[PDB]
Ligand binder design. Sequence first.
Ligand code: BCB
Ligand code: BCB
Ligand code: BCB
Ligand SMILES: C/C=C1/c2cc3[nH]c4c(c3C)C(=O)[C@H](C(=O)OC)c4c3nc(cc4[nH]c(cc(n2)[C@@H]1C)c(C(C)=O)c4C)[C@@H](C)[C@@H]3CCC(=O)OC/C=C(\C)CCC[C@H](C)CCC[C@@H](C)CCCC(C)C
Ligand SMILES: C/C=C1/c2cc3[nH]c4c(c3C)C(=O)[C@H](C(=O)OC)c4c3nc(cc4[nH]c(cc(n2)[C@@H]1C)c(C(C)=O)c4C)[C@@H](C)[C@@H]3CCC(=O)OC/C=C(\C)CCC[C@H](C)CCC[C@@H](C)CCCC(C)C
Ligand SMILES: CC(C)=CCC/C(C)=C/CC/C(C)=C\CC/C(C)=C/CC/C(C)=C/CC/C(C)=C\CC/C(C)=C/CC/C(C)=C/CC/C(C)=C/CC1=C(C)C(=O)c2ccccc2C1=O
Ligand SMILES: COC1=C(OC)C(=O)C(C/C=C(/C)CC/C=C(/C)CC/C=C(\C)CC/C=C(\C)CC/C=C(/C)CC/C=C(\C)CC/C=C(\C)CC/C=C(\C)CCC=C(C)C)=C(C)C1=O
Ligand code: HEC
Ligand code: HEC
Ligand code: HEC
Ligand SMILES: CC(C)=CCC/C(C)=C/C=C/C(C)=C/C=C/C(C)=C/C=C\C=C(C)\C=C\C=C(/C)CC/C=C(\C)CCCC(C)C
Ligand SMILES: CCCCCCCCCCCC[N+](C)(C)[O-]
Ligand SMILES: [Fe+3]
Lengths: 58, 58, 58, 332, 24, 24, 258, 182, 323
Amino acid sequence: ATEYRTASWKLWLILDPRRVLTALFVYLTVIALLIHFGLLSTDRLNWWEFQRGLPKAA
Amino acid sequence: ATEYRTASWKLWLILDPRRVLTALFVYLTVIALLIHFGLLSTDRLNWWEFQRGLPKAA
Amino acid sequence: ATEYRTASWKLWLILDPRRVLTALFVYLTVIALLIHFGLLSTDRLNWWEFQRGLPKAA
Amino acid sequence: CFEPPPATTTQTGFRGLSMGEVLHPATVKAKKERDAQYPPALAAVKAEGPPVSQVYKNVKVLGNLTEAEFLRTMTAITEWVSPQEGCTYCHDENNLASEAKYPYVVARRMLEMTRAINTNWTQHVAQTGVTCYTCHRGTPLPPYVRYLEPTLPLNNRETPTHVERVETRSGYVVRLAKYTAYSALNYDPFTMFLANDKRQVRVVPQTALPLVGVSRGKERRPLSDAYATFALMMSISDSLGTNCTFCHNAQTFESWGKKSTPQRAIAWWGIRMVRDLNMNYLAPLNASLPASRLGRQGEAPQADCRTCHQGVTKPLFGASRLKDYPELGPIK
Amino acid sequence: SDWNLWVPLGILGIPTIWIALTYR
Amino acid sequence: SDWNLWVPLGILGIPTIWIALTYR
Amino acid sequence: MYHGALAQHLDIAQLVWYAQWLVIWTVVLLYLRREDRREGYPLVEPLGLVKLAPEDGQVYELPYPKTFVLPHGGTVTVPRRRPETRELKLAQTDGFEGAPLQPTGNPLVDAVGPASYAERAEVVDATVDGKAKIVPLRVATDFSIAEGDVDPRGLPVVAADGVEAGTVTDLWVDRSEHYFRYLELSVAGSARTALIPLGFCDVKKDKIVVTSILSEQFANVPRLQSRDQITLREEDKVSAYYAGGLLYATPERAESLL
Amino acid sequence: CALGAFISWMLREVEISRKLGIGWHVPLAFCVPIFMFCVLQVFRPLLLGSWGHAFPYGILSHLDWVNNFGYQYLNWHYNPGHMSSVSFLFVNAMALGLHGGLILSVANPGDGDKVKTAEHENQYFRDVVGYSIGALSIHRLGLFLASNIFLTGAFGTIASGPFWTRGWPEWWGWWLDIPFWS
Amino acid sequence: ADYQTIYTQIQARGPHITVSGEWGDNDRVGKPFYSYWLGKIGDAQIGPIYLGASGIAAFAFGSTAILIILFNMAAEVHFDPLQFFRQFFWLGLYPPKAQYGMGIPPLHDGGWWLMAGLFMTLSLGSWWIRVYSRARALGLGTHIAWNFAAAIFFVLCIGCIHPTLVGSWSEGVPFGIWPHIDWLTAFSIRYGNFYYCPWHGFSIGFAYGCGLLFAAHGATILAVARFGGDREIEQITDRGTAVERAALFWRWTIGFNATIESVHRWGWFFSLMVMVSASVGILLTGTFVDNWYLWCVKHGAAPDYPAYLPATPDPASLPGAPK
Ligand code: BCB
Ligand code: BCB
Ligand code: BCB
Ligand SMILES: C/C=C1/c2cc3[nH]c4c(c3C)C(=O)[C@H](C(=O)OC)c4c3nc(cc4[nH]c(cc(n2)[C@@H]1C)c(C(C)=O)c4C)[C@@H](C)[C@@H]3CCC(=O)OC/C=C(\C)CCC[C@H](C)CCC[C@@H](C)CCCC(C)C
Ligand SMILES: C/C=C1/c2cc3[nH]c4c(c3C)C(=O)[C@H](C(=O)OC)c4c3nc(cc4[nH]c(cc(n2)[C@@H]1C)c(C(C)=O)c4C)[C@@H](C)[C@@H]3CCC(=O)OC/C=C(\C)CCC[C@H](C)CCC[C@@H](C)CCCC(C)C
Ligand SMILES: CC(C)=CCC/C(C)=C/CC/C(C)=C\CC/C(C)=C/CC/C(C)=C/CC/C(C)=C\CC/C(C)=C/CC/C(C)=C/CC/C(C)=C/CC1=C(C)C(=O)c2ccccc2C1=O
Ligand SMILES: COC1=C(OC)C(=O)C(C/C=C(/C)CC/C=C(/C)CC/C=C(\C)CC/C=C(\C)CC/C=C(/C)CC/C=C(\C)CC/C=C(\C)CC/C=C(\C)CCC=C(C)C)=C(C)C1=O
Ligand code: HEC
Ligand code: HEC
Ligand code: HEC
Ligand SMILES: CC(C)=CCC/C(C)=C/C=C/C(C)=C/C=C/C(C)=C/C=C\C=C(C)\C=C\C=C(/C)CC/C=C(\C)CCCC(C)C
Ligand SMILES: CCCCCCCCCCCC[N+](C)(C)[O-]
Ligand SMILES: [Fe+3]
């Protein structure tokens, strides 16, 4: 190893960058979607619309 | 490597540009559509239409 | 054993890191989602929304 | 989404036929909570003095009562219809006998209507009867009404989205579907069957063989009429929160006798009663309302099943005030 | 504010420690 | 503006640091 | 007055009903069922009383004969009279019509019960070109295993005992289906290759497990006539041997569970 | 007695197949409908807690049960378990037709034409629709289609009552109502 | 378990041999490719495809139809692309809603319906020809064509023939996912309950029959695949232990058997019969029977049950009823 401290790196000998990469891509995208849409489906916490909340108002 | 600082680039020896390119192309396109259409299905932030948002008015 | 105490480690001779790793990944994700959404489906312990709880009020 | 067990089940037809209602116990609880805000009867008063017709000056419906009774009624009315604006809502504060505010003159007519229901449609509403509350549920705009286009959402206390708004032309199909229990049937059954007495609901032939002279070409009805009936039924079901087998034995939708429950009779009267309401009390109000109330084709709002039942087979689970407010009917 | 109620702390914490110490 | 609502910073920040330091 | 009324109680629908029925049964009986008797009929009798005629209604039964003109010359006529002349090594439990039979010697070699084969024509199965259909991968050099699978060549064949019977020499391919039919293994202890149907072995990463028969009886799997091609009869012979072992490998395979 | 008969039937088959040294596929396949019977007559009634939820024995009578049951959810056609089952039912029928025909065409090619080969089966389909599933696998596939008629349906059946009490169309609301494009 | 019946463990690759037709060896189209996943259930190779005239034509009409259908579905949501995609199953192309008898209806009310109908009809036919011709091209028998025929005919019956015999286009099936289904209920309600029509019966019988038969045949072949029973054609011309067992199995169970050849006939026959039975029923309906239940009662087939809740006389028929 070129000046390392742990052996962490050896993970990639075991695991495969391409899998991890492609997976993370997906994983994060989905989560990101869930949150975004999720938020935009509330009343508080929707930008993109007039305040449906009727927050305390009536 | 022509005066490169990182090894970053070796990624393309691992990954395959053609896949990446094609995926982004699609990925992006979709997000883009979601945003466009999704926006244009609100009341505020719909250009293209008359403000039948009736913002608070009535 | 490079200054070890137990043989605990021999587990990975028997088990396979990759299986464990990949499963834990999923297992945890699911429990995480469970709790998050679970909470966010109550009345007390919903952040993201106005206090629908009507805590005692009405 | 996958609604968890158990289920309340009843039996409405002969054993082994799979007829009867199927309820989610949870949902019923929720509805029962909702139908409990019905304000309790007011404390009864001693009938003492002269008739109101001699006391006041502008009574034209409730002439009979005593001064004290009369005000009781007014108090009840207030609570059922306009609790928030109070008395003020349809009276000038000082000259009470002024017909100035618009709701006043609607309200006089509503009184006539309610009376009539509790007198002439006894065969739908029985000894249970209705009060303003039945429909209004404590607002001056009853939370389920109908216009001549399908609108959404069903409950007009919620706020519409962009696609739900009537003006959004793309959203029509959905506006329609939600009215008929999410099926894709393409007819608005309110305007076909309920608004007036102009169509026949019965579509099935009452004989085994095709009857010569009504059975071919332009003699025949269009298969539309079947779908349209199937639509009216879908909606009725959702309006009562029940299924076909609460009234028909599917074996033969068309048949009566041992193939229909007693409910089906009541429903038949039901239909004839809403029609009367719409054609005679409700629809000709577009003369009296403000334009703000009126629909796109300049019509007043009208009633259908949901307007009263609101998703229960008996409105307000059959809670009544019929003995407590005999001003509201029946009459002699 | 975590007062009188160390319940989750105990549940979370205890294992955290013996997981630390058992597998060295 | 986080007023003792360091909560998400806590959840976001902490691991961010040890992820920095553990795999070096 | 009604459409479709033949009397005050008789309508055209009602008549059609029966009609429909009629046809169904006719087809079933006067056709389909006849077509069914092209193989193995007329029925044979080894107890009953002076019978040249099955369930009665039926010695017409057999339809008149077809004549399949075969792809690579010759004709077959159906139904036929193909006589069984192998002399079965089976003793009867009772002399009774439908009482079962006991094998006299070794059932796996004497080829009886689940170990019996049909006397098929002693010719090689062919392609549309006129090549041999079933061949090994020494011959079909053009054919190959799909990239991503386990090549079973080299692996140990473990039998029912948990004992290595021998090692895999080759795969055999169907040339007109692109499908593998046989493993050819080298039976250890003798100087012989025996052919196992691929439907009798669970192929793993390390080993081929053969539940069918015991290690010792690999020595007696029927011998191939040629080295590089297989006849139709030899196929049946090979297959029947292992399947027979499903009832006859161990004595307990006979018995009921209790 | 019914259950009795069915099961005894199925086990008999197992005994038979043992005797012949053939696979047990047949008995097992026969197990699927048995299960559906059990689902309708036993489980679903258990879950709703009465026998009175089961269907009656009677040629026309049984259909009356089917009929009303289905209108208890307002339009059974929309129940997604049903959709799948129905699809299989149809595919299966069509597929049997094709398999039937294809063998028969090869065997009885008309005139004094020679019986054709396996390659002709393949060619034929790879022409008409451009794919051939191949000879063994069709058998395998047939068994699969057939079987999911009940396997998938069983889901829709059990669901109705214990896990869903509204009309089946209302259930597609999940999609129809995703608030994004609502 | 025996894994070799469920999926394929070791896949084979090699040169596929083309059977030369009578004509149109030239009109095979495309680079044949493989799918390793598909290779686990069947052949992996996916091209080429025959083209020729019938094809061309079938596509021609077929597409036109599709276009008219979709286009009108779009027009239902007023071309809002987002809504289209959300509402898609609920959209349809409907036949005429007024009574015009059999006159070619106005464009906006059923006109377009009719056109698509005609074109769908034409594609079906063109295709039929494809199926039939190809068979003859390769010296096979025509069985598939004839089965397919019956199917087509039944489509005709519910599409135009029945409408015709009663004489109104209003009775046509609509195009669209949900709405083609709503048709089913309407149609049944109108003709007094289809469970009670005998041909609906027959049909279903045969349909379930197919289920039974394929499961059985399917299972049977796999059970004897160890003896090479999947090689069904060679089994016909030179009977091996495989089908001997298969026969025996069935004989010892239900007490009569088939042949390897004839089982195929049975299956083919049952398949056909679904479609035929159906067609008949459809033709009889509206034309000779008006209400199938009542008809079953006239022939006393219909079961009758006692009342659970009190029996209810129809209110329309009371003294002093409204309308
Ligand atoms: C009211 C609050 C809001 C909010 C609150 C907010 C927070 C708190 C955060 C964001 C974040 C984000 N927001 Mg945002 N948001 C965004 C979009 C975004 C993204 C730019 C970013 C999401 C990063 C991510 O999730 O990674 C998903 C996928 C990733 C990272 C994949 C790439 C990594 C991959 C593993 C590496 C591989 C790359 C290879 C080259 C490709 C491989 C190809 C394969 C398939 C072969 C849009 C479009 C809008 C609109 C239109 O309104 C919006 C509105 C809002 N956001 C509201 C106003 N949002 C996050 C962020 O980090 O900002 C940048 C974030 O933390
Ligand atoms: C108005 C109500 C309807 C309805 C109500 C409905 C219900 C409630 C159910 C189905 C079910 C099914 N429906 Mg549907 N249906 C279907 C098709 C189907 C089947 C695919 C599927 C399963 C049938 C079944 O359960 O077998 C039953 C067969 C069994 C149980 C096996 C019995 C065999 C036994 C093991 C052996 C018997 C041996 C004999 C006793 C031996 C006697 C023989 C002699 C030789 C002695 C079609 C194609 C249509 C059309 C075209 O509209 C339709 C319309 C309707 N269905 C109407 C909309 N249907 C079932 C399903 O899967 O739902 C999702 C189901 O539960
Ligand atoms: C409430 C209404 C019901 C109903 C209404 C009903 C009607 C009205 C009819 C049937 C019919 C039938 N029903 Mg029934 N049904 C059936 C099953 C059946 C089928 C056996 C048979 C329909 C024939 C068929 O297979 O269609 C599927 C096969 C078809 C449609 C042929 C398609 C072939 C075509 C060439 C396809 C190729 C198309 C191309 C690819 C074109 C592409 C299009 C382009 C151009 C856009 C079951 C199993 C059940 C159960 C279990 O309850 C049931 C209950 C009901 N049915 C409910 C009671 N059913 C028919 C019948 O038999 O009546 C006597 C019929 O007319
Ligand atoms: C997806 C899977 C499909 C499938 C599969 C397979 N199907 C099989 C096999 C496989 C693999 C066999 O191996 C086995 C068989 O042997 O091959 C012929 C069999 C068989 N499938 C029969 C009928 C059949 N398959 C149906 C459905 C599917 N099959 C589905 C589609 C249906 C439908 C759908 O209604 C029917 C009616 C019998 C002919 C036969 C067993 C005889 C029996 O069971 O013996 C035992 C019982 C009797 C002979 C009589 C029983 C009398 C009882 C005691 C009491 C009276 C009955 C009472 C319950 C009243 C009900 C009547 C009422 C509704 C009005
Ligand atoms: C019991 C008897 C059963 C039975 C029997 C049989 N069934 C058969 C056969 C037999 C024997 C055949 O021989 C034939 C066939 O060959 O199969 C191999 C066939 C068939 N049954 C099909 C589908 C089916 N069977 C069903 C049912 C039953 N079958 C009943 C149950 C059902 C149900 C139940 O719904 C369905 C959906 C097709 C596969 C096939 C017709 C192809 C056609 O007729 O083509 C017509 C051509 C078209 C529609 C053109 C396509 C145009 C494309 C999509 C592009 C349009 C896009 C456009 C907007 C723009 C243009 C640009 C473009 C480039 C992008
Ligand atoms: C003589 C003497 C000593 C007397 C004294 C003895 C005495 C009286 C003793 C006591 C009697 C006792 C104890 C018992 C009685 C006997 C007994 C066990 C009886 C059980 C009988 C019984 C209930 C029979 C009913 C049969 C039954 C359930 C159904 C009938 C069959 C039906 C309706 C089938 C559906 C129709 C159908 C699918 C037909 C398909 C056609 C065929 C044949 C399909 C099968 C089949 C398939 C599917 C193939 O794939 C295949 C592939 C290659 C070759 C052949 C075949 C093949 O044959
Ligand atoms: C040999 O001669 C022959 C040929 O070769 C020459 C042929 O090619 C041919 C035929 C030529 C061909 C091209 C054949 C192709 C014809 C076809 C109809 C193939 C088409 C098949 C399909 C489209 C698949 C059907 C899919 C549908 C109908 C849509 C269903 C919709 C939904 C939502 C289904 C959802 C659920 C699923 C998809 C799967 C659910 C599965 C489960 C719940 C459990 C699964 C059960 C198992 C896996 C079995 C248990 C496991 C074990 C026992 C080990 C014949 C006839 C001939 O015999
Ligand atoms: C929703 C409408 C409505 C509300 C709310 C309402 N009223 Fe009335 N009120 C009427 C109508 C209509 C009449 C005339 C009734 C008639 O002619 O029989 C009336 C008549 C009266 C009269 C007789 C007028 C006269 O000639 O002197 C009095 C007094 C009266 N209301 C008092 C009240 C009081 C007090 C309240 C509230 C506490 C009240 N009302 C609330 C509709 C309403
Ligand atoms: C069966 C249904 C029904 C009953 C019962 C009923 N109402 Fe109404 N009411 C309506 C409908 C529908 C409208 C029309 C919606 C509207 O005009 O706002 C209406 C309108 C009104 C309005 C006009 C308010 C406005 O702002 O437009 C008043 C006031 C009113 N009702 C009072 C009464 C009173 C008082 C009673 C009882 C004596 C009563 N209603 C009973 C259905 C009913
Ligand atoms: C609340 C009672 C009730 C329910 C619930 C109900 N119906 Fe009806 N249905 C009726 C009445 C009443 C009629 C007859 C109305 C008339 O005479 O005008 C009727 C008529 C019909 C008809 C016409 C019969 C004919 O004579 O031509 C059909 C078909 C029908 N219903 C089907 C359904 C279906 C399907 C459902 C469930 C989706 C359903 N019904 C739910 C009360 C009901
Ligand atoms: C004499 C005169 C004037 C006219 C005679 C006309 C004539 C022959 C009329 C007869 C008409 C007939 C046979 C009509 C039949 C109609 C029937 C059976 C319709 C039935 C079902 C249709 C369904 C389920 C179709 C739904 C269709 C869709 C949702 C859209 C179509 C799209 C697809 C199937 C996907 C492919 C498109 C993709 C490549 C982008
Ligand atoms: C409702 C459709 C059912 C059609 C009937 C199916 C025929 C069953 C075959 C019986 C065979 C008779 N036998 C024993 C003489 O071969
Ligand atoms: Fe077959």
